[PDB]
């Protein structure tokens, strides 16, 4: 529920900002399309 | 058929020491008379030590797997 996809993320940019901050604090311990990915793999 | 409260004496005698109605030792103590000084020494039947007569320092018994073997020539009585 915290980081679920929203219908219009652009209309609530500020809200999104908070979430990012929260993640950066929550997951600080760790930090310390299909077609696109397949295209990169095949190009390599 | 047998009565557990009043077992037969022979029946209890056959059983293991710990398996009788009231467990108790099957060992005993002996008065061993030294051949030389004729004094009496108390010796355990299953003695694990080479009991020596204090006055004469003579070997009275030798340890074995079970009952100790009394030295030859030593008279004994059950105490």
């Amino acid at each position: 529920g915290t980081y679920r996809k929203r219908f219009n993320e652009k209309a609530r940019s500020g809200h999104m900002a908070k979430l990012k901050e929260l993640k950066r604090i929550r997951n600080k311990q760790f930090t310390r399309s299909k077609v696109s990915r397949l295209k990169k793999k095949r190009l390599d | 058929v047998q009565d557990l409260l009043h077992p037969t004496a022979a029946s209890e005698a056959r059983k293991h020491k710990l398996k009788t109605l009231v467990q108790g030792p099957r060992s005993y103590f002996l008065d061993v008379k030294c051949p030389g000084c004729l004094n009496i020494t108390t010796v355990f039947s299953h003695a694990q030590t080479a009991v020596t007569c204090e006055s004469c320092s003579t070997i009275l018994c030798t340890p074995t797997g079970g009952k100790a073997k009394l030295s030859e020539g030593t008279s004994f009585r059950r105490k």
Partner: protein, 150 residues
């Protein structure tokens, strides 16, 4: 029944029912105590004293004759092992095994038995620490265990 083994033996000593001294026993309760102290002064452990008294003096059981256990009689008279008798012997056995291993590094069997003995020391040492017989900061460390057994 055996811990650290599959055996189930039941060989044990069967205390007699009667809790009084034998009728054929005609020695004072005091005189036994000096015998216990004299042997303890000679250095014998409580187990070895009881064998001598029982074998060669007719003392069926120290508690029955004197009313107190051998270890208690020794402690009352100022004779007290620095560490309990059984824990002393477990440490002694482990030291001998370690002395065997250092020469024989392929003796995987002795390597296994050393673990069983040490795991037996820790369980026994854990018991004494709880009762306060052994100081709470007491650890069996492999290197200096030779000092304790001396």
């Amino acid at each position: 029944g055996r811990m650290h083994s599959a055996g189930k033996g039941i060989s044990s000593s069967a205390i007699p029912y009667s809790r009084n001294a034998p009728a054929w026993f005609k020695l004072s309760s005091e005189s036994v105590i000096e015998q216990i102290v004299k042997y303890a002064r000679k250095g014998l452990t409580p187990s070895q004293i009881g064998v001598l008294l029982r074998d060669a003096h007719g003392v069926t059981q120290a508690r029955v004759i004197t009313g107190n256990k051998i270890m208690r009689i020794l402690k009352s008279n100022g004779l007290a092992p620095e560490i309990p008798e059984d824990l002393y012997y477990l440490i002694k056995k482990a030291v001998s095994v370690r002395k065997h291993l250092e020469r024989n590094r392929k003796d995987k069997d002795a390597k296994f038995r050393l673990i069983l003995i040490e795991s037996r020391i820790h369980r026994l040492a854990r018991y004494y620490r709880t009762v306060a017989v052994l100081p709470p900061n007491w650890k069996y460390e492999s290197a200096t265990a030779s000092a304790l057994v001396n």
